[PDB]
Design a protein around this ligand. Sequence first.
Ligand SMILES: CC(=S)O[C@@H]1[C@H](O)[C@@H](COP(=O)(O)OP(=O)(O)OC[C@H]2O[C@@H](n3cnc4c(N)ncnc43)[C@H](O)[C@@H]2O)O[C@@H]1O
Ligand SMILES: [Zn+2]
Length: 272
Amino acid sequence: HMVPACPPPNPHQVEQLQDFVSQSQRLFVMTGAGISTESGIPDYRSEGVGLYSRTERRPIQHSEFVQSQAARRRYWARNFVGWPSFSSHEPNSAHVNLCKWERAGRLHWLVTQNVDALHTKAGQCRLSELHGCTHRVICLGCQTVTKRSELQERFLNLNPSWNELTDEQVSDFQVPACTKCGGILKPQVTFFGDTVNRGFVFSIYEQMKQADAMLIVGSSLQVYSGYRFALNAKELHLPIAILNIGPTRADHLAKVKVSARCGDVLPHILLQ
Ligand SMILES: CC(=S)O[C@@H]1[C@H](O)[C@@H](COP(=O)(O)OP(=O)(O)OC[C@H]2O[C@@H](n3cnc4c(N)ncnc43)[C@H](O)[C@@H]2O)O[C@@H]1O
Ligand SMILES: [Zn+2]
């Protein structure tokens, strides 16, 4: 399964993370793909187990999606097949506990790199989805945003022989067009080489200014899109803590690092 193996969790690290969280009133939290491996969603870079470490998965480049009809067909045919299982994943105790922390007024804001909607399903309201969400679809022509669940029905009517990975296998596969303008639809996620909207970025940094600490959960921070927010914490003179099984790009900035499954540790952190 998808959770990398980890030595047994060290109690002293756990204690230091508690003390970190106790010192905070306005925690800024960043999560990545490690917070959803316990929900059955694989991560990308866990050594020996992530999609890029262990498999032939290559992300799609944005510019190829935008410039090639055939690339769009291959993308969408795979996304169509995977949607019923992908859409059925549930939040795990880590997402649930972060939502508790928000209810208690101790989590100031959370940013995720994940596109899986799990923080939303769990009920995290003070949330930014840094890379978007696969449950939303956007037209490249008019910017209208629709629900992915609604697109599925449309895929079924257009490709009824698929209800009975190369260009040849995808020939009988047609992609629904935008119903407002006839333009190209895309999952409202940040593909490789596309960049996050600068006003959105700027609004997340604005939430940081009032935090008093940062916690990173379940990200390698290898992608600059996420690591920049740890850099920003350091510029704000915020203490940083990490709860992550493998190494991260921010390990040198952290005051406290807990190498442990996040669903084993978070339920133990108390707010009183
Ligand atoms: C634009 C897009 S969607 O980019 C995606 C993604 O948003 C982005 C950033 O990736 P990430 O940091 O979210 O994911 P990854 O680099 O795979 O790191 C996940 C980390 O989680 C750790 N981990 C694994 N399961 C656990 C666990 N249950 N408890 C605690 N630690 C865990 C792993 O050790 C690993 O260091 O890169 C991709 O191309
Ligand atoms: Zn449109």
